[PDB]
Structure 1
């Protein structure tokens, strides 16, 4: 089947289409104005793989956390796209997406995701890929102050890969914790990494109707 993923949760916007494993994706840093770029990206990606919106089985959307406005804009477009085509929707975490990206690029299986939320906050998550490739640790997603993150890091063990803008925003985090951290090579989520996660949810039937697609509230 086919899965179309869309992400506009952060400073970047991206689209990806999954077709029996074969991926078609596009990623670009999105200005303070995302909306104007999604639709064209979507139509390009669909055309590239010779697919119609009505031929897609599910539409994966970025449920955040991240930009309050950006996350909601993306969900809005996604719903529009899914409603007009009667498509089931799949919410995917921005933090989990970056973790999958770390696995894709560096083979990391334990990811500490930290997003530099404005005004001194950070969106945090501790993700660990299990044997079936499902990222465990969604219950750890939270919005914390740098200080509490530093506190959290002292309770962790084993090695981890770091992903997200939060690390460069608060360089003391990786420095003061006694953990062995590796660079996940992921600063921002990419729709292409949303696909593997959306597919596993589809396989389990964890989808939502258009009217129930919403942003995560941490």
Structure 2
């Protein structure tokens, strides 16, 4: 199969292509340049592997959580491409993507993913890779205050690798044996094994069904009196 993955949910810009196993990937820090870099990166990664957008079997996208703007850039670009080329779509968690990155870089099978969302809260997840390489723990994805995370760490056990900017923002959060996962930001190349599992299970969506995962759904505005 052929899978194209893109990600702009955080401070990074990344694209990757899977061609029956072989991976071509590009990653860059693109703060305030997301819209300026993503389509040139897609065009370049396709031209490199001699791939046409029409021959792609699934378009994997960073569904979030992360930057509201960034998540919407990623979904917008992916929706335009998938609608334009009639491509099935696969939403991949940015939290699970960083877990896969920690496994690729360190061999870690148990990952505590924390993204430093604004207002002093974090996007949190507990991910564990099974014998089949599937990351379990999607139901644990939540937006938490660091105090609630600290309480949660007391309930867990064993060895864990830490990933994301949440640990940069709150490094005093680190009973448990914690190791650095060596991942602060997601990369599109780590989306490709998750998207490959999802495509094999027939868990793709049509372009009109692609939705972001924000976690923070509360509005930063009060409603008018009464």
Q: Please give the range of the TM-score, normalised by the shorter of the 2 chains.
A: over 0.9
- CA apart distance, 1:118: 1.2
Alpha-carbon distance in structure 2 between the residues aligned to 1:70 and 1:208 = 21
Alpha-carbon distance in structure 1 between the residues aligned to 2:112 and 2:100 = 12
Asked whether the 8 Å contact 1:35–1:74 carries over to 2, the reply is no
- CA apart distance, 1:33: 3.2
- CA apart distance, 1:142: 0.4
Alpha-carbon distance in structure 1 between the residues aligned to 2:192 and 2:50 = 18
- Structure 1 gaps of 5+ residues are none
Aligned with 1:117: secondary structure?
Answer: coil
Paired residues, number? 214
- CA apart distance, 1:112: 0.2
CA offsets 1:60-96 (integer angstroms, 9 cap, x no match): 0000000001101110000100111000000000000
Aligned with 1:91: secondary structure?
Answer: strand
* Residue range with higher mean Cα deviation, 181-190 or 24-33: 24-33
- CA apart distance, 1:53: 0.1
Asked whether the 8 Å contact 1:12–1:189 carries over to 2, the reply is yes
Alpha-carbon distance in structure 1 between the residues aligned to 2:83 and 2:148 = 41
Alpha-carbon distance in structure 2 between the residues aligned to 1:157 and 1:31 = 36
CA offsets 1:141-173 (integer angstroms, 9 cap, x no match): 000001100111110001000000111211110
Alpha-carbon distance in structure 1 between the residues aligned to 2:82 and 2:135 = 25
- Structure 2 gaps of 5+ residues are 215-226
CA offsets 1:85-108 (integer angstroms, 9 cap, x no match): 000000000000000000100000
Bigger-Rg structure (1/2):
2
Aligned with 1:206: secondary structure?
Answer: coil
Alpha-carbon distance in structure 2 between the residues aligned to 1:191 and 1:86 = 21
Spell out structure 1 runs of 4+ moving beyond 6 A: none
